[PDB]
Structure 1
Amino acid sequence: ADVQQKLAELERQSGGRLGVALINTADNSQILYRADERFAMCXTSKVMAAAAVLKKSESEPNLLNQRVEIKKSDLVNYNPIAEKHVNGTMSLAELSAAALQYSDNVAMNKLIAHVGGPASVTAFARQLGDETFRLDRTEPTLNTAIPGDPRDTTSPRAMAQTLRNLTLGKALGDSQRAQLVTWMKGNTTGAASIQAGLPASWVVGDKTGSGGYGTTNDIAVIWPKDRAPLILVTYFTQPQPKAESRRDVLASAAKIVTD
């Protein structure tokens, strides 16, 4: 009850719409707030795309080493790693790391294209038992985040359950699961989001996202000191098209649900 009141007060102060799902594997419990509503995923969808490539690699051993050409025509609106490789190639492993650890949007588009497009990433989610996730578009348009638009959305409940399967469960083979966890633990974009609301000693693998309407998101697997792991999804979006990012709201939500 107190946790619910605190999340409601945070949402009201923020001026926007907040979605939270925590899974505590110590006791198989959940803390949920707007957890069945849809939110634009933005960059957080890169986890599903990278996982689809990892699954494909289980039956194709040379897959992560496969080379992909990077051209000026591939550049989109945020290309921190790919811009350094124009006119050469990157491997699928390198593209996966760039997408997950730097939010590189060219890298996301190469993962999407490799597996057959947004409908193939969605069909992979369905094969895992996630019947909520939908990836409709490529970068950069998947980030528009218009209120009421179901494109490129999922719910906090669904994304927490799927992230648990991918990182702690058996969706991927042992080598592939370990690779995903290692990539997420090395993320560089998350220190002001969920991590900022947790003790310094806790270990985190996370993926952030941001987009139109001040959309500010983070999804994480968390190893608290001497405790069973947690899965946490914090999604946030605002009423104004040009609203600024609010990573502090995600930090505040993480503190509330883990105190």
Structure 2
Amino acid sequence: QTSAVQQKLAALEKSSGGRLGVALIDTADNTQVLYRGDERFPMCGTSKVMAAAAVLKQSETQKQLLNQPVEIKPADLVNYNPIAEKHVNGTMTLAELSAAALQYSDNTAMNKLIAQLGGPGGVTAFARAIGDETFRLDRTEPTLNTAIPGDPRDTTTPRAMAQTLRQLTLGHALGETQRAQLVTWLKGNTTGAASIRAGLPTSWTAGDKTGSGDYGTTNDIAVIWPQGRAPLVLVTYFTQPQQNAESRRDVLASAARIIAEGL
């Protein structure tokens, strides 16, 4: 079948010139709205949530892990290091690296999270451990953001990512203290105002993690607390056919607005 919201998302996609994937979970009744919900999309920076969560999980059995210093060398710097660049020849704790990766989308910080987990496969193993059989991280930063059409590397589906984000932020995939830390980090994101959040009623609160890459790949995943109602989880992925396509955060905002209006 095809619902009204699904029809509106289809119209948005057609006018956009790209491919749109959406997954909503409304925890008020556990109902879902999917659009290309089982198609694979490049995650880009949205994968940073899985890496941070995996390190939080490790910290459950090490009350001091988040305070562990990690050396940042000049050679470690990649293509987007707004926080790490200030700490070259110094150190950052895993908590600092998690906050930098999530709230500033720092790619060098993400690489340190991946390294702590033993490589991209370590992040994938954590995803499997919490019931996500779809997610796959294959590369480090920044090549995990190449976003080449058809490439299965570093992809997931909207359905899978929404279910996992729910488990992490609203469920029991993490311990209570760790879940609160993850939510606090997401709510403090600095990069998300033009994406999902731009399509929501002003009064609503949210935590999100953006992603972007080649092929005008423009992503966002969010946990939303609408004013006076049970939280939602929303994933919006978008990618385009030309390598040099422009970013389209307005498409994500439009998708979120359609979703919000349809509740």
TM class by smaller structure: over 0.9
- Unpaired runs of 5+ residues, structure 1, are none
Is 1:235 equivalent to 2:241 in the alignment?
no
1:16-27 to structure 2, matched below 5 A, reads 16-27=18-29
Separation in structure 2 between the aligned mates of residue 202 and residue 252 of structure 1, nearest angstrom: 16
Separation in structure 1 between the aligned mates of residue 5 and residue 58 of structure 2, nearest angstrom: 41
Aligned to 1:85: 87
Residues 134-176 of structure 1, C-alpha deviations (whole Å, 9 max, x = no match):
0000001001101000000000000000000000000000110
Runs of 4+ in 1 over 6 A off after TM superposition: none
Aligned to 1:188: 190
- How many Å apart are 1:258 and its aligned residue? 1.2
Q: Provide the secondary structure at the position in 2 that maps to 1:64.
A: helix
- How many Å apart are 1:132 and its aligned residue? 0.1
Work out the number of aligned pairs and report it.
259
- 1:128 partner amino acid: I
Separation in structure 2 between the aligned mates of residue 249 and residue 86 of structure 1, nearest angstrom: 37
- 2:34 partner amino acid: L
Aligned to 1:113: 115
TM-score, with length taken from structure 2? 0.98
Q: Provide the secondary structure at the position in 1 that maps to 2:15.
A: helix
Separation in structure 2 between the aligned mates of residue 120 and residue 82 of structure 1, nearest angstrom: 22
- How many Å apart are 1:5 and its aligned residue? 1.2
Identity, % of aligned positions: 82
- How many Å apart are 1:2 and its aligned residue? 1.6
Is 1:204 equivalent to 2:211 in the alignment?
no
Aligned to 2:149: 147
1:63-102 to structure 2, matched below 5 A, reads 63-102=65-104
Residues 23-60 of structure 1, C-alpha deviations (whole Å, 9 max, x = no match):
00111100000000000000000000000000001111
Separation in structure 2 between the aligned mates of residue 211 and residue 235 of structure 1, nearest angstrom: 11
Separation in structure 2 between the aligned mates of residue 21 and residue 148 of structure 1, nearest angstrom: 20
Separation in structure 1 between the aligned mates of residue 63 and residue 259 of structure 2, nearest angstrom: 41
Aligned to 1:256: 258
Separation in structure 1 between the aligned mates of residue 230 and residue 8 of structure 2, nearest angstrom: 24
- Unpaired runs of 5+ residues, structure 2, are none
Separation in structure 2 between the aligned mates of residue 183 and residue 67 of structure 1, nearest angstrom: 19
- How many Å apart are 1:4 and its aligned residue? 1.3
Is 1:31 equivalent to 2:39 in the alignment?
no
- 1:208 partner amino acid: T
- How many Å apart are 1:184 and its aligned residue? 0.2
Separation in structure 1 between the aligned mates of residue 4 and residue 95 of structure 2, nearest angstrom: 44
Separation in structure 2 between the aligned mates of residue 240 and residue 121 of structure 1, nearest angstrom: 29
Separation in structure 2 between the aligned mates of residue 167 and residue 37 of structure 1, nearest angstrom: 23
TM-score, with length taken from structure 1? 0.99
